[PDB]
Design a protein around this ligand. Structure first.
Ligand SMILES: Nc1ncnc2c1ncn2[C@@H]1O[C@H](COP(=O)(O)OP(=O)(O)O)[C@@H](O)[C@H]1O
Ligand SMILES: CC(=O)C1=C(O)N2[C@H](C1=O)[C@H]1c3c[nH]c4cccc(c34)C[C@H]1C2(C)C
Ligand SMILES: [Mg+2]
Length: 980
C-alpha cells in the first residue's frame, strides 16, 4: 500500500481486510508473501578474488604480455633432459610479474564494501506481529513480515518495515529517523492521516520507516510496505541503478592500451614487409624472438606499481590534512573537480549558533511605531556575555517586554546547556538553535538571580530554572514544517500574578507567527496589531536577515487567553496552528551561525582555481543569498536573480530550465534531498566533475552519483560508505585543500606517465633497427624487464615528489578530454623515442664495429648473414659485451631523461636537477643496481652481460648525455615559438 499516510486508520484496514484486534489469517500471510515477496533487500550480487583476478587478464595488454609468454615457451625446446641449468627465465619472469601485477589491482586497490551492502545493517532481524493463529505478540524473523499484518514496536526497537501507525498505546511516541536525516533529536508521531498524497517524509508523521528506532513510547500499526518498496528500500534501488563511470585517467589509459596493442600488431607485420639448406622450423622461430622483444619493449610493465605507489603515498598525505580518501583512484579525479556543492551548517559554518540582536516594541501611537532594540555579546554557548542598548550595557530585567522575551525563550524551549568538566567548556543539549535561546535567557538574567556565586555546572541552566519555577509546562505542540512554529501550554504555580487565564507561548519563524498576531505587547500593556506596526516589525526582520549580519530570526508571541484545556485535540497536529492563533507579538530574537574562519579564503581559492562553489541550505532564499555574499560566493553588490533558487522555485521549472539553471546556479535554499540527485545529474549533462556533500541515507543516492561524494567525520555510518572522501573535521576547506593536492598528484602523474612511456617508444625503435637492419638484438626481454620495473622504476616514483607550481591553483580545472600526449609533446617524445632507438643500437654494434678488445669488423655486413651456413666472407654474435653496451646506454639516458621530466617546459637551467632531492637519490640507487647486476656473478650471467671497461663507460656517456641537449632545445621552442 503506497499512499498510506493519506488514508485514514480505517481505510488502511479496509485495504488489507484485516482486524486490528485479530490480525492476519495464516492464509493471507501466504497469498500476500506471494504477491509482495519477502521483507528483505535483494541479496548481494557476489564477488571473489579469483574471478577478480580473471577479470584482469582479459585486458588487451595483459593478453599480449601473456601471448609473449606463450611464445617465450615455444622457442626454447621440448620435454625433459638434463641440465644447461641457465635457461627458462624469459618466460618465467613475465608470468611471475603478471601474477604480481594483477594482484596489485586488488588487495591495495580496494573494491569491496559498497553503500548498498551497508543498507543491510539497518534492516532488522526480528519483528513483532499479531496474526490470527495465536493471541500473543508473536515475534518473527523480519524477513517474513508482510504488507498488511499488524505490528508492535516499543522503546528501543528497530522498525521492521514501513508502517502506518494504528494506535499509540503509550503517553506519546518518539521515533529516531537519524539514519535517514542525521539529526540526533527524536520526532513525535501521531495517527491522523496526512492528507496530501505527495507529502515528503518529514511530513509523514503517522508513519514509521523501516530502519528507524523508537526512541520512546510504544505503538501498534499496519505494515504499509516492505522489502524494496519502503523508503529505505527505495534508496537502495536508486543506488542500484547507478552506472559508475571510470576516472578520466582510467579512461584515457584504457584507450592507450587499445592503441598500444594495435601498434604492436602493426609493427609485427611491418617487420614482415621488409623481410640454402635446412628446414622450415628455425625461420618460423626467428620472427618470434623479435615479436616477444617488441612485446616487452612497448609495455611499461612498471606503470601499475608506480601509480599505486603514488596513490597510496597521496592517501596518507591528504589524511594529514583531514581528508580521508577511501576509493584509491579518486585521488586523480579529485584533481579534475569542477564544481563543489556544500551544505552550509557544519561545513561552511561552525554550527555554534548564538543570539546577538533582539527587539521588542517601545511605543505605538497612530503611525509612530518605535522599536526598543538591544544587542548581545558572546559567540559561545557559555552564559558569559552581556546585553547592550545604544551600545552600552543595560540591565535586561528593567524592560518589561524583555522579561516576556526570556520567559518564552525558556518555557517554549526543549533544549539546555551542560558544563563539560573534561574540555572545561559548556555543551549544547538538543537543538543548536534552541540551546542558543537557553544561553540567552542566562545572559539576560531578567530577575537578577545571584549567579556569580554558583559554579560552572550549576549556573549553566540557572536563570532558566528560576523561570521554570514561575510557570508550569503542561503539554506542548511540536514544530511542523507546515505551520513553522511551536508552542507550549503553561500554568501558574506559587504566589505569583497570573490568573483567569493560562498562556500558550508560541515561538516560530517570523512571517508565520506575526500573521497570527492580532495584538502587540507594548511593555506589560497590549494594543491591537496594525499595518504600520506590522510593517516596522517586518522591516527590521528583513534587515537583520538579509543584512551583512545574516541573522536567523524568531518571532516570539503568546496566546494571552488560550482555549480551555478540554477543547484542543492534542493528537491532531493539523489543528495545532488554530490553537496558535489570536497571538500577541512580544518580540524577535535573531541569531548567527558563523561561517568557518577558514572558508572565506578557501572560497576565493576556488575562484582563482576556476572551480564553482554551490551552497545548499535551509535558510530562506533571502538569508541564503546574504550568507553567500558574506562568504564570497557572490560579490557584495552584484546580480544574482537567476543564480539562487529555492526548493519550490526549482520544482516549478520544466526540466530544460532546471538543467539550464544548474550551470549558472550557486545557491539552493530550502531544498529536498531529492534535488541533490537531480542537481548532480544536471551538472554531469555538462561534463562537469562534481564534489557533493551530504549525510544521512537520504543523501546516499547523491553521494553515489557525484564523481566525488563527501561525508562528514561526525556523519552517519551509511553516509560515509556512500562517499569517496570523508572530512574528518567536517571543514569545508578540507575539501578545497584535497582538490589542490589531487591537482598536484595528477600533475606529477602526467609526468612520470610520459617518462615511463618515453622509454618504451625508444626501446621499440631500437628493436625495430636490430630487425630492420638485421643485426643481433641489442636488447633482450630479461634486460628490458629490469629497466622498466626497477631501472626506470625508482626515478619514475621519485618523480611523484616534484615541487608543485606556485600557480597550481591559479589555473582553471583540467578537462577530462585532455590527452596526456598531444601536439608538440607528441613530436617531442617521438624524437626522444627516435634517439634512444638509435643510441642503444649505435654504441652496441659499435662493439662489433669500432671497438678495441671486441671483434671490430667495420661494415662486415652483419645484415647479410647471422646464419654462418657459408662462413665464406670470413658465436661471438651471442657475446655479453655488446648487449652491455646497449643496456648501459639505455639506463644512463633514462636517468638523464628522468631529469628532463622534473618540469614540462622549464630548462634544467631554470629548473635545477637538484630541486627534487629524491630524484637524484633515486638515480644514485638506480646505477648502484646497474653495477650490482654486473659483478655479483650470478646476476651478469643471468642477464647475459659482462662489466664494461673504463673505455666502454665513456662511450656511453658520449652517446647518452647528448639527449639532455636535444631535450632543452624542444623546451625553449615550445617556450618561445609555440606560445600565444
Ligand atoms: N524543505 C524545507 N522546507 C521548509 N523548511 C526547511 C526545509 N528544509 C529545511 N528546513 C528548515 O531549515 C533549517 C536549516 O536547515 P539547513 O541550513 O540545511 O541546516 P539543517 O538542514 O542541517 O538544519 C532546518 O532546521 C529546517 O528547520
Ligand atoms: C595482469 C594485470 O593486472 C596487469 C598487468 O600485468 N599490467 C597491466 C595490468 O592490468 C597492463 C595494462 C593494462 N593497461 C595498461 C596501460 C599501460 C600499461 C600497462 C597496462 C601495463 C600492463 C601490465 C603488464 C603492467
Ligand atoms: Mg546538514
Amino acid at each position: 500500500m503506497e499512499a498510506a499516510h493519506s488514508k485514514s486508520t480505517e481505510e488502511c484496514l479496509a485495504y488489507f481486510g484485516v482486524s486490528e484486534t485479530t490480525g492476519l489469517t495464516p492464509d493471507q500471510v501466504k497469498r500476500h508473501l506471494e504477491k509482495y515477496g519477502h521483507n528483505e533487500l535483494p541479496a548481494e550480487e557476489g564477488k571473489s578474488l579469483w574471478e577478480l583476478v580473471i577479470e584482469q587478464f582479459e585486458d588487451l595488454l595483459v593478453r599480449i604480455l601473456l601471448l609473449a609468454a606463450c611464445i617465450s615457451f615455444v622457442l626454447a625446446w621440448f620435454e625433459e633432459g638434463e641440465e644447461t641449468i641457465t635457461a627458462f627465465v624469459e618466460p618465467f619472469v613475465i608470468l611471475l610479474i603478471l601474477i604480481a601485477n594483477a594482484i596489485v589491482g586488488v588487495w591495495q586497490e580496494r573494491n569491496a564494501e559498497n553503500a548498498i551492502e551497508a543498507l543491510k545493517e539497518y534492516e532488522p532481524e526480528m519483528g513483532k506481529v499479531y496474526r490470527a493463529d495465536r493471541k500473543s505478540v508473536q515475534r518473527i524473523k523480519a524477513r517474513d513480515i508482510v504488507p498488511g499484518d499488524i505490528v508492535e514496536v516499543a522503546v528501543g526497537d528497530k522498525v521492521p518495515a514501513d508502517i502506518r501507525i494504528l494506535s499509540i498505546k503509550s503517553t506519546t511516541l518518539r521515533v529516531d529517523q537519524s539514519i535517514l536525516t542525521g539529526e540526533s533529536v527524536s520526532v513525535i508521531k501521531h495517527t491522523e492521516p496526512v492528507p496530501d498524497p505527495r507529502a515528503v517524509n518529514q511530513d509523514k508523521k503517522n508513519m514509521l520507516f523501516s530502519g528507524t528506532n523508537i526512541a520512546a513510547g510504544k505503538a501498534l500499526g499496519i505494515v504499509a510496505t516492505t522489502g524494496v518498496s519502503t523508503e529505505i528500500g527505495k534508496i537502495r534501488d536508486q543506488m542500484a541503478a547507478t552506472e559508475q563511470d571510470k576516472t578520466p585517467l582510467q579512461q584515457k589509459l584504457d584507450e592507450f592500451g587499445e592503441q598500444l596493442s594495435k601498434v604492436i600488431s602493426l609493427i609485427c607485420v611491418a617487420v614482415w614487409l621488409i623481410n640454402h639448406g635446412g628446414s622450415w622450423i628455425r625461420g618460423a622461430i626467428y620472427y618470434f624472438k623479435i615479436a616477444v622483444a617488441l612485446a616487452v619493449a612497448a609495455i611499461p610493465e612498471g606503470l601499475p606499481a608506480v601509480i599505486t605507489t603514488c596513490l597510496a603515498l597521496g592517501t596518507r598525505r591528504m589524511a594529514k590534512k583531514n581528508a580521508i580518501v577511501r576509493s584509491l583512484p579518486s585521488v586523480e579525479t579529485l584533481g579534475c573537480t569542477s564544481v563543489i556543492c556544500s551544505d552550509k551548517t557544519g561545513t561552511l559554518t561552525t554550527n555554534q549558533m548564538s543570539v546577538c540582536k533582539m527587539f521588542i516594541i517601545d511605543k505605538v501611537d497612530g503611525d509612530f511605531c518605535s522599536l526598543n532594540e538591544f544587542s548581545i555579546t558572546g559567540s559561545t554557548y557559555a552564559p558569559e556575555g552581556e546585553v547592550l542598548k545604544n551600545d552600552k550595557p543595560i540591565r535586561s530585567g528593567q524592560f518589561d517586554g524583555l522579561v516576556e522575551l526570556a520567559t518564552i525563550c525558556a518555557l517554549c524551549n526543549d533544549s539546555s546547556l551542560d558544563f563539560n568538566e573534561t574540555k572545561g567548556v559548556y555543551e549544547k543539549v538538543g537543538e543548536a538553535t534552541e540551546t542558543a535561546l537557553t544561553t540567552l535567557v542566562e545572559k539576560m538574567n531578567v530577575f537578577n538571580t545571584e549567579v556569580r556565586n554558583l559554579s560552572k555546572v550549576e549556573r549553566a541552566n540557572a536563570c532558566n530554572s528560576v523561570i521554570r519555577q514561575l510557570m508550569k509546562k503542561e503539554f506542548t505542540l511540536e514544530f511542523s514544517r507546515d505551520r513553522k512554529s511551536m508552542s507550549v501550554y503553561c500554568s501558574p504555580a506559587k504566589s505569583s500574578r497570573a490568573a483567569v487565564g493560562n498562556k500558550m507561548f508560541v515561538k516560530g519563524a517570523p512571517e508565520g507567527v506575526i500573521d497570527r498576531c492580532n495584538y502587540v505587547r507594548v511593555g506589560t500593556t497590549r494594543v491591537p496589531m496594525t499595518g504600520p506596526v506590522k510593517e516596522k516589525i517586518l522591516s527590521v526582520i528583513k534587515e537583520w536577515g538579509t543584512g551583512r549580519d545574516t541573522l536567523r530570526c524568531l518571532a516570539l508571541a503568546t496566546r494571552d487567553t488560550p482555549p480551555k484545556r478540554e477543547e484542543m485535540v492534542l493528537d491532531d497536529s493539523s489543528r495545532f496552528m488554530e490553537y496558535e492563533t489570536d497571538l500577541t507579538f512580544v518580540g524577535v530574537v535573531g541569531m548567527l551561525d558563523p561561517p568557518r574562519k577558514e572558508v572565506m579564503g578557501s572560497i576565493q581559492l576556488c575562484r582563482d582555481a576556476g572551480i564553482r562553489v554551490i551552497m545548499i541550505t535551509g535558510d530562506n532564499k533571502g538569508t541564503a543569498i546574504a550568507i553567500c555574499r558574506r562568504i564570497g560566493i557572490f560579490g557584495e553588490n552584484e546580480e544574482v536573480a537567476d543564480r539562487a533558487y529555492t526548493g519550490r522555485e526549482f520544482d516549478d521549472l520544466p526540466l530544460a530550465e532546471q538543467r539550464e539553471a544548474c550551470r549558472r546556479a550557486c545557491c539552493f535554499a530550502r531544498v529536498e534531498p531529492s534535488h541533490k540527485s537531480k542537481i548532480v545529474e544536471y551538472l554531469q549533462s555538462y561534463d562537469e566533475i562534481t564534489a557533493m556533500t551530504g549525510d544521512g541515507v537520504n543523501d546516499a543516492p547523491a553521494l553515489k552519483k557525484a564523481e566525488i561524494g563527501i561525508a562528514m567525520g561526525s556523519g552517519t555510518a551509511v553516509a560515509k560508505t556512500a562517499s569517496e572522501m570523508v572530512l574528518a573535521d567536517d571543514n569545508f576547506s578540507t575539501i578545497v585543500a584535497a582538490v589542490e593536492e589531487g591537482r598536484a598528484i595528477y600533475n606529477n602523474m602526467k609526468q612520470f606517465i610520459r617518462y615511463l612511456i618515453s622509454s618504451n617508444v625508444g626501446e621499440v625503435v631500437c628493436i625495430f633497427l636490430t630487425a630492420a637492419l638485421g643485426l643481433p638484438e641489442a636488447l633482450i626481454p630479461v634486460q628490458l624487464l629490469w629497466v622498466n620495473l626497477v631501472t626506470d622504476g625508482l626515478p619514475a616514483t621519485a618523480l611523484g615528489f616534484n615541487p608543485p607550481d606556485l600557480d597550481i591553483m591559479d589555473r582553471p580545472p583540467r578537462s577530462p578530454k585532455e590527452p596526456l600526449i598531444s601536439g608538440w609533446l607528441f613530436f617531442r617524445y617521438m624524437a626522444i623515442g627516435g634517439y634512444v632507438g638509435a643510441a642503444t643500437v649505435g654504441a652496441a654494434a659499435w662493439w662489433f664495429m669500432y671497438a678495441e678488445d671486441g671483434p671490430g669488423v667495420t661494415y662486415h655486413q652483419l645484415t647479410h648473414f647471422m646464419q654462418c651456413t657459408e662462413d665464406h666472407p670470413h658465436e661471438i654474435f651471442e657475446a655479453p659485451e655488446p648487449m652491455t653496451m646497449a643496456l648501459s646506454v639505455l639506463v644512463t639516458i633514462e636517468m638523464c631523461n628522468a631529469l628532463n621530466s622534473l618540469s614540462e617546459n622549464q630548462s634544467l637551467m631554470r629548473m635545477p636537477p637538484w630541486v627534487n632531492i629524491w630524484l637524484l637519490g633515486s638515480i644514485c640507487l638506480s646505477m648502484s643496481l646497474h653495477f650490482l647486476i654486473l659483478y655479483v656473478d650470478p646476476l651478469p650471467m643471468i642477464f647475459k652481460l659482462k662489466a664494461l671497461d673504463l673505455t666502454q663507460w665513456l662511450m656511453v656517456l658520449k652517446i647518452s648525455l647528448p639527449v639532455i641537449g636535444l631535450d632543452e632545445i624542444l623546451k625553449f621552442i615550445a617556450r618561445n615559438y609555440l606560445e600565444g
